[PDB]
Structures are given as structure tokens and as C-alpha cells.
Amino acid sequence: KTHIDLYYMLVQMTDEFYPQLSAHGKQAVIHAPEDLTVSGDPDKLARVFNNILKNAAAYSEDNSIIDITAGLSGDVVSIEFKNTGSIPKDKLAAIFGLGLAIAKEIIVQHGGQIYAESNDNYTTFRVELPAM
């Protein structure tokens, strides 16, 4: 009988990252309906998103935007972090203090999935969680 108000969880995280991001002229912007909700362990999910943003911040190019889009489509709530810059493909095949291994099991324990891709222009992290 619980739920996470996702937009506001993402906002709080973004605000914790603001000093680190502004120092390189970066900016995280959230695109999401504010009505959007999901089930799960709130403090565990916040750590998932924190770890991912930590990765986006580390591989994001100076003076660029980190987009965090979240939406409900069918049975899936998806949260997608996209940044300009690339993860070296050897660090990328290893990705599962930037290790997303715990993030992954948290999401997996939630019945969800994490996708990471990277070309050489931008990097995408995608979290999918079951919808209520």
C-alpha cells in the first residue's frame, strides 16, 4: 500500500548533485509528468538513481546537459539518463566507486531492468520498473 513520487525523488537527487554539476557547467534536467508514481523500496531506489547519476556526471562532457526522462508506457515505468560523452567500451562492458552491480540487483529485485549503452556522442542509462 505504498508508492514513490518519482518526480520528487529525482528532483531531490538532482539538487544534491547541483554543486558537482555546476562546477563543470553541467546541468541535469528532469522531463517527467509530476503525477508519476512507482512501487518499491524508496531508499533503495534512490540509491539506484544516485549511482547512475554518479556515472553520468563522471562521463558527461564539460558544459553539457544530462537529461533524465521518466514516463509510463503500458506496464513499464522507465527512467532514462542521457549524457553527452562516451564510456570507454571496456569500462562499459564492466559496468555491471562507479560500479552499478548493486544498483542492478536492487532493480532486479524490484522485477525490473537496467540498460546501459554508449556510442561516442552520448551515453544512455535506462531503468525499467513494473508499473502499479
Question: 42-73 burial, b for 16+ CB within 10 Å, e for fewer?
Answer: eeebbebbebbbbbbbebbeeebebbbebebe
When divided into structural domains, the chain yields a total of 1
Angstrom resolution of this structure: 2.2
Experimental method: X-ray
Half-sphere exposure for 10 (CA within 13 Å, toward CB): 26
Judge whether 106 and 47 are in contact, CB under 8 Å: yes
What is the domain range of residue 37?
1-132
Instruction: State the chain's maximal CA–CA distance in angstroms.
Output: 43
Residue 62 to residue 42: CA distance in whole angstroms: 31
